[PDB]
Amino acid sequence: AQPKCNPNLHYWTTQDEGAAIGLAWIPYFGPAAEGIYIEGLMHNQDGLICGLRQ
């Protein structure tokens, strides 16, 4: 009930969680994506998710 770093693994920490392309370039990698494309948190964060264990 207190994970550590949710979107600070790789698919997000590396790129823009599928925002450095446009999303509408694939047939499912983005539009269909949900926990990779998210779209709404890609702001280079690491405290609201990857702080200590929240």
Automatic annotation (TrEMBL):
<comment type="function">
    <text>Functions as a decoy for anti-GP1,2 antibodies thereby contributing to viral immune evasion. Interacts and activates host macrophages and dendritic cells inducing up-regulation of cytokine transcription. This effect is mediated throught activation of host TLR4.</text>
</comment>
<comment type="similarity">
    <text>Belongs to the filoviruses glycoprotein family.</text>
</comment>
<protein>
    <recommendedName>
        <fullName>Envelope glycoprotein</fullName>
    </recommendedName>
</protein>
<feature type="disulfide bond">
    <location>
        <begin position="5"/>
        <end position="50"/>
    </location>
</feature>
<comment type="subunit">
    <text>GP1 and GP2delta are part of GP1,2delta soluble complexes released by ectodomain shedding.</text>
</comment>
<comment type="subunit">
    <text>Interacts with host entry receptor NPC1.</text>
</comment>
<comment type="function">
    <text>Acts as a class I viral fusion protein. Under the current model, the protein has at least 3 conformational states: pre-fusion native state, pre-hairpin intermediate state, and post-fusion hairpin state. During viral and target cell membrane fusion, the coiled coil regions (heptad repeats) assume a trimer-of-hairpins structure, positioning the fusion peptide in close proximity to the C-terminal region of the ectodomain. The formation of this structure appears to drive apposition and subsequent fusion of viral and target cell membranes.</text>
</comment>
